[PDB]
Design a protein around this ligand. Structure first.
Ligand code: HEM
Ligand code: HEM
Ligand SMILES: C[C@]12CC[C@H]3[C@@H](CCC4=CC(=O)CC[C@@]43C)[C@@H]1CC[C@@H]2O
Ligand SMILES: C[C@]12CC[C@H]3[C@@H](CCC4=CC(=O)CC[C@@]43C)[C@@H]1CC[C@@H]2O
Ligand SMILES: *[C@@H]1O[C@H](CO)[C@@H](O)[C@H](O)[C@H]1NC(C)=O
Ligand SMILES: *[C@@H]1O[C@H](CO)[C@@H](O)[C@H](O)[C@H]1NC(C)=O
Ligand SMILES: *[C@@H]1O[C@H](CO)[C@@H](O)[C@H](O)[C@H]1NC(C)=O
Ligand SMILES: *[C@@H]1O[C@H](CO)[C@@H](O)[C@H](O)[C@H]1NC(C)=O
Ligand SMILES: [Mg+2]
Ligand SMILES: [Mg+2]
Lengths: 240, 240
């Protein structure tokens, strides 16, 4: 029971904190999280993710508390803090550049081209297109970034993020692992819920049981292999 | 402001949650944290560690948020949750057994013997004794624990914990990196502030600048070296 008319999209202003995550950015841009993107807690993320997307607490508590590590504060972050490389933020993003060779924070259209051009001849993105995109994005990083980090952990996060856009921006049952291109494109390009375009919050809860087989299938189809030491160590706090 | 006389030691009851950390347990046993050891946030830890020990927010925010990962809750833990092996809890503890070959949670006198017998002929523990104890405890784990984990991360946490007992249970300036045996022994064995015995909260702030060189010196004197997997990966949540 949520009124989205009470949660209009507004462009972030100059001092509004935004991060590398289109999911949290979009929530902020609709006031499900504070529009200023600051002093955000895990409880706020849980509630916002539920209200906006029908994403459940299981994934948001797990991801949320890892994200809290990126700030210097006891129990909040600014959305921009999440750019901290090697906590959650990773190389071979769908819409951002690798931190060693560019901007790991802002939407980048040239990077997004690979996703935007995926699944030619359908009007949806799906599990096989998502996997191909992941394969191609990793190949790009391996080719152009000598400092690329690619581990079981980064690969899992990446597949989770692909599963997120397929499910949250779905038309049908998020189970189907497919989302209209016109919805997903608005999500990434404008960090807006495509309400005008016909999108509605899922009526099916999106949780780890639902996401898990989608994640695993994306990974499997992506023809993935580790790089280097394959160490799943995260950065535990900023400025260590 | 803070009145220690209003914070008497009381033994935990059977349903009071206690963890592998004598620092947090002691605070709970004095009501600086909830005596039941539950529903504890990073802000609560920050305030309790300041009031009880003069430990500053820098280290408590960093450690606190890593510890939050051990629970299934959005922003709190039970003290017992911190026993989760491979988040913070590690092998070659000073006063607990390795989880693969015993109890990683409760104080164990036989394990503590090594610490208790360190620095023979002085009435203090100090940086060189702390280092010897760490060397000997790791040797014990390598000898007796087929599942031993020893990484740069576990070694650093271990030196941090040793620096904690040398500083928080100090008589003089915590700078000196030495603490009376009679204070440290009560701290570990009873998880009590040794007020009766003459201990007072440090009047010098204990923060990362103060602890850093003590930690590094303990590590250096401990003659530590990597032994296998040196991947400093933490466990990101329970039930994975
Ligand atoms: C609530 C639903 C969520 C959705 C739908 C979502 C969606 C996404 C998507 C699609 C990406 C990939 C962007 C890209 O590769 O360019 C992403 C990245 C990210 N998300 Fe989320 N997210 C959500 C929740 C969260 C939470 C709770 C956190 C942390 C508290 C988080 C932190 C991040 C971070 C740090 C990245 C950067 C990874 C990278 O691309 O390097 N997200 N998110
Ligand atoms: C955020 C705050 C804290 C958290 C989350 C935390 C957590 C932990 C955990 C999980 C352990 C078990 C490590 C192991 O031995 O396997 C531990 C050990 C320890 N902690 Fe804490 N701690 C905190 C603050 C403090 C403080 C303020 C002190 C001050 C005295 C302290 C002193 C110790 C000591 C001495 C040990 C070693 C126990 C042993 O090796 O037997 N801790 N801590
Ligand atoms: C929550 C998270 C995305 C989802 C990941 C999680 C790591 C563990 C994990 C394993 C799986 O098999 C499913 C996805 C999950 C549940 C990641 C840690 C940080 C990241 O944002
Ligand atoms: C906070 C912490 C103790 C202090 C550690 C920190 C890891 C990084 C670190 C490196 C140092 O050189 C000093 C101690 C510190 C700052 C640890 C992570 C978990 C543990 O409780
Ligand atoms: C994705 O769509 C393409 C084209 O419509 C199709 O060939 C492919 O089999 C689909 N994959 C999945 C997983 O449904
Ligand atoms: C935990 O603490 C919060 C914050 O004070 C409170 O609202 C809540 O009721 C508590 N939960 C339990 C289980 O007591
Ligand atoms: C620790 O105490 C012993 C015995 O008093 C002494 O010989 C040693 O030098 C001390 N070490 C440090 C670092 O103070
Ligand atoms: C611990 O070591 C034993 C002996 O090598 C091995 O059989 C077992 O799988 C290990 N356990 C874990 C937790 O890996
Ligand atoms: Mg990235
Ligand atoms: Mg231990």
């Amino acid at each position: 029971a949520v009124d989205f008319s009470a949660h209009p999209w507004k462009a972030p202003g100059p001092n509004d904190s935004r991060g590398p995550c289109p999911g949290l950015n979009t929530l902020a841009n609709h006031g499900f999280l504070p529009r200023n993107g600051r002093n955000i807690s895990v409880p706020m993320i849980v509630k916002a993710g539920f209200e906006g997307y029908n994403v459940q607490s299981d994934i948001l508590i797990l991801a949320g508390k890892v994200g809290m590590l990126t700030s210097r504060e006891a129990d909040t972050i600014s959305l921009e803090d999440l750019k901290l490389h090697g906590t959650i933020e990773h190389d071979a993003s769908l819409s951002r550049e690798d931190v060693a060779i560019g901007d790991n924070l802002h939407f980048n259209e040239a990077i997004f081209t690979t996703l935007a051009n995926s699944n030619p001849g359908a009007d949806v993105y799906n599990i096989s297109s998502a996997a191909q995109v992941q394969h191609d994005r990793l190949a790009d990083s391996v080719a152009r970034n000598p400092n690329v980090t690619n581990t079981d952990l980064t690969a899992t996060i990446r597949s989770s993020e692909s599963a997120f856009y397929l499910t949250v921006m779905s038309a049908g049952d998020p189970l189907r692992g497919e989302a209209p291109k016109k919805f997903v494109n608005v999500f990434f390009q404008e960090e807006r819920m495509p309400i005008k375009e016909g999108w509605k919050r899922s009526t099916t809860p999106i949780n780890l049981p639902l996401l898990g087989p989608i994640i695993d299938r994306i990974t499997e189809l992506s023809d993935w292999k580790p790089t280097g030491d394959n160490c799943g160590a995260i950065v535990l706090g900023p400025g260590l």
